[PDB]
Amino acid sequence: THETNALHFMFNQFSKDQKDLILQGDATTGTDGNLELTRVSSNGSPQGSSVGRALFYAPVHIWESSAVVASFEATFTFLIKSPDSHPADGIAFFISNIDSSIPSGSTGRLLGLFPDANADTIVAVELDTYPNTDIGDPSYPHIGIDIKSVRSKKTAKWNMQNGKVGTAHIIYNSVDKRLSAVVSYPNADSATVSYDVDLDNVLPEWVRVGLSASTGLYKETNTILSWSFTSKLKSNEIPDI
Amino acid sequence: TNALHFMFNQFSKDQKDLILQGDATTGTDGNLELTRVSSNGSPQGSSVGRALFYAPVHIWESSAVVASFEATFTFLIKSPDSHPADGIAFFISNIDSSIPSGSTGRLLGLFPDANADTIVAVELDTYPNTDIGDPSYPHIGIDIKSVRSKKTAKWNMQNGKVGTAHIIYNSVDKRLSAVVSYPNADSATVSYDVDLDNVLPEWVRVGLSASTGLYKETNTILSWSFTSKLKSNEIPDIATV
Amino acid sequence: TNALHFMFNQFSKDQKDLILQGDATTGTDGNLELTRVSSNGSPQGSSVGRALFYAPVHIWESSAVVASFEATFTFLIKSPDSHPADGIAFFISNIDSSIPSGSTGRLLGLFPDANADTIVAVELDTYPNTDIGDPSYPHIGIDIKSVRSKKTAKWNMQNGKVGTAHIIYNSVDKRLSAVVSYPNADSATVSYDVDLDNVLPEWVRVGLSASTGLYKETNTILSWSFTSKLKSNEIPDIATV
Amino acid sequence: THETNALHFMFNQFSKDQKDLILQGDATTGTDGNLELTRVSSNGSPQGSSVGRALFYAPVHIWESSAVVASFEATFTFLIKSPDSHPADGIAFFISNIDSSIPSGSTGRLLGLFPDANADTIVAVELDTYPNTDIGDPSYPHIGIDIKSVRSKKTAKWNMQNGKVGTAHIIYNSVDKRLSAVVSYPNADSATVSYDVDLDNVLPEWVRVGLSASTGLYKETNTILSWSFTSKLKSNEIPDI
Ligand SMILES: [Ca+2]
Ligand SMILES: [Ca+2]
Ligand SMILES: [Ca+2]
Ligand SMILES: [Ca+2]
Ligand SMILES: [Ca+2]
Ligand SMILES: [Ca+2]
Numbered sequence A, D: 001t002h003e004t005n006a007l008h009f010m011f012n013q014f015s016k017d018q019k020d021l022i023l024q025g026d027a028t029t030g031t032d033g034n035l036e037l038t039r040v041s042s043n044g045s046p047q048g049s050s051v052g053r054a055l056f057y058a059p060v061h062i063w064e065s066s067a068v069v070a071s072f073e074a075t076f077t078f079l080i081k082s083p084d085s086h087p088a089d090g091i092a093f094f095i096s097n098i099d100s101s102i103p104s105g106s107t108g109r110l111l112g113l114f115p116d117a118n119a120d121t122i123v124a125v126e127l128d129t130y131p132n133t134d135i136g137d138p139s140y141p142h143i144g145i146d147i148k149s150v151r152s153k154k155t156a157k158w159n160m161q162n163g164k165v166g167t168a169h170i171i172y173n174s175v176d177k178r179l180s181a182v183v184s185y186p187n188a189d190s191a192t193v194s195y196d197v198d199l200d201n202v203l204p205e206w207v208r209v210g211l212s213a214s215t216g217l218y219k220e221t222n223t224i225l226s227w228s229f230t231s232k233l234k235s236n237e238i239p240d241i
Numbered sequence B, C: 001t002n003a004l005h006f007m008f009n010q011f012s013k014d015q016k017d018l019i020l021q022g023d024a025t026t027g028t029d030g031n032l033e034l035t036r037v038s039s040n041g042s043p044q045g046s047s048v049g050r051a052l053f054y055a056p057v058h059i060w061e062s063s064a065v066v067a068s069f070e071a072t073f074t075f076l077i078k079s080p081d082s083h084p085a086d087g088i089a090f091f092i093s094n095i096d097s098s099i100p101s102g103s104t105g106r107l108l109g110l111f112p113d114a115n116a117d118t119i120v121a122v123e124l125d126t127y128p129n130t131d132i133g134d135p136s137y138p139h140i141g142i143d144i145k146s147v148r149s150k151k152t153a154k155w156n157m158q159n160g161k162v163g164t165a166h167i168i169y170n171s172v173d174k175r176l177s178a179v180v181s182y183p184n185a186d187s188a189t190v191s192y193d194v195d196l197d198n199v200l201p202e203w204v205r206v207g208l209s210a211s212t213g214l215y216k217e218t219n220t221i222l223s224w225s226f227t228s229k230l231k232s233n234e235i236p237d238i239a240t241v
């Protein structure tokens, strides 16, 4: 039908002066047509104590006073390399208040999203490369759903492939009120995580969507090779079933 | 992930991708008339017609790979008196399903009696027949191998207005939902827990059915779209809207 | 292949993904009123308004990588007399473009005079002004850096009916096309050979503009969608419909 | 908008008894979830003098008496292996009259599509593995647009990769009246070919879409790993610009 508001963007390539991206922290574009979320040295080696994010310029309308909530899909391809086989801390796809910025000291385990481990409102999927078991991480690389806290509401084990290009697929289904992620490498296993959450209880009506990454003492390239996003809001739709 | 999607926003005479049974015709004002109408727009009694999409739908493969699906249609039910009958149904059947003998009126072109082919239907039931187990108002109903609905919702049907019907089958949570709506009115919604891979064969046809009996109405379809995704039941459904 | 797509089928007050300039407002009956209307639905003279999508559009990258694009909008132009003015335009500008001084009436909110910002527009011109080079009937026109159209087609505009406008830029063949249509009427169509990567900057905003002067009309937008694909000019465009 | 007829199918996997595919000649499904268009021996070696095709079951509506023509996209992934480095004869995506069958003696250079080299109406894109310069092939592997004749209207050189999975992307744009193909391997060059042709001059109003392959004296696996098709027809659209 014809009763739907929608936003779609796709980057298969990033250049210098990517005017439709807001870059925060150490994030740069247009090195080999990639988005580097964390600082990489002149020789290609990642740096510690780094944090960076890229947000799409247009705000996204995610719910309305009718309790009608947008459905959305995000897809990105990433390259995490750690030459020392000591990677940290990971990549996140997030949804935030529109004027959200990098919280003070959100390097390392806090992934550029949270100021502490329990100002800004965050819903994220984490690709978490480093287990911090003292803040509820399982004791392995994992994907997680983060609702207003780095202490994931749900996690699944993630067999991350040092130096391989992987794909993350984020799905919000507003019929089911379910946030899900699938992370995969070619000719390898997929990891998946789901969590039931109505975003009209959690986020503002208007948000920005972004990618965030951090390093700490340990470090990794947090390289994004492509990023696509689609959001659909049908204002005259039944808000729940 | 195997997929089928079709969309009719216009019908023509000789619609080669539809199987028309009974009194069904396509092309009059670009519409599908499931039941007999006179040249003047007068609907006839004792009429039954169905339209099936020509292509069979792969509705399950294994315990891991099953099909989520969605159907939408827009309809115009009109009678010259206060007493329209008998209604419109969206159905999934065995691929070689035909109209059962005497299935006019209350049996909606789907069932030989009120308790052969395997039928799962969502019924837009305009006429309450209390002796075959209808509630005593017009209703939307989920029918699993029987005209006696497993679950119904009251339907405030508007004689002579264009309505929208939206059917959702979630193969992960095992839930069949229907929403029916007119402009500026609250929707009717019904949901029922049913694993369709235990009821239906591997291959199905999907269709629209409609009937009149003693009482009569136009059973005019203005549009009909359908999407089926045969996929892992470990991965979450992407919403359509 | 970088892509942007948006679709408005409904506008709200505080549409954060639109930049409103001049007299433009959003939300009255879920519509975008580009020019001033009274509470009773009476359009005012000497009015000008534009809506720009918040996100900038990457319209070329290199001699190999350039953007094909498509825009559709639906509009209601209504006056109480036989004499509506001055019309609606779809435009591409430099990203920080604002309404030029005195651009009401015949200049359509796009141009300071009839021969600053870089403007490329498709004009739905409701009022023939022969001294700034309009033909002597209502027309659709392609405007490249000038209100004096490079090419026009006669437009049989229907006061008080909902029209559809469809703009296509083919970056391979270097051709800017517009089609305007009402239900049950023949379309008006105009095409013009122009390499937009020689006229426009690398980054643009896209927008709708409208004006009234001495004579007046409603400049109501009911929907607006846009797709831009920045891709190799060795590969063929995929049509939208 | 809401004025479009559409058909979409996607196969990422083929099983035995693929009821929505018509198989012709030597074509089989459900060996390693693949479609084998030509005969492969029990040990995995391709056979000579083989021809086979797979057609989608639902007919596709490609034009109307208004001269409105469908736009369409087809994508497939294929594996051509010849252990002897002597491959023939190739794969084609085609569009035919609905009841089209394999012409007598269409093995080898005739690709399962034509009865001779100058009953059925064919438009095809060929992935031609074997140069027959006496019927106008260039003297290398090439992609070709075939309008009612194996003597390609347009060809481009194709650097085919023995034993690699490749992707073919077929585009018909009805705005441009242009049939195009792109053929690619991962981390390798793309080959592209285009030809201007209005299909309402060439095909029936209703068609089937298919894949065809042949071997001759020389042979290759003609393995299809995935196949997707989308066709859109907007009946109230301007038929040409
Ligand atoms: Ca961690
Ligand atoms: Ca099976
Ligand atoms: Ca009944
Ligand atoms: Ca719905
Ligand atoms: Ca540039
Ligand atoms: Ca004028």
Ligand SMILES: [Ca+2]
Binding pocket: C166, C179, D237, D238
């Ligand atoms: Ca159009």
Ligand SMILES: [Ca+2]
Binding pocket: D089, D109, D128, D129, D130, D131, D132, D137
């Ligand atoms: Ca050949």
Ligand SMILES: [Mn+2]
Binding pocket: A126, A128, A136, A137, A138, A142, A144, A152
């Ligand atoms: Mn974690």
Ligand SMILES: [Mn+2]
Binding pocket: B123, B125, B133, B134, B135, B139, B141, B149
């Ligand atoms: Mn009932």
Ligand SMILES: [Mn+2]
Binding pocket: C123, C125, C133, C134, C135, C139, C141, C149
């Ligand atoms: Mn003009």
Ligand SMILES: [Mn+2]
Binding pocket: D126, D128, D136, D137, D138, D142, D144, D152
């Ligand atoms: Mn050839």
Ligand SMILES: [Zn+2]
Binding pocket: A067, A069, A198, A200, A201
């Ligand atoms: Zn809610």
Ligand SMILES: [Zn+2]
Binding pocket: B066, B174, B195, B196, B197, B198
């Ligand atoms: Zn089941």
Ligand SMILES: [Zn+2]
Binding pocket: C066, C174, C195, C196, C197, C198
């Ligand atoms: Zn150019």
Ligand SMILES: [Zn+2]
Binding pocket: D067, D069, D198, D200, D201
């Ligand atoms: Zn034609």
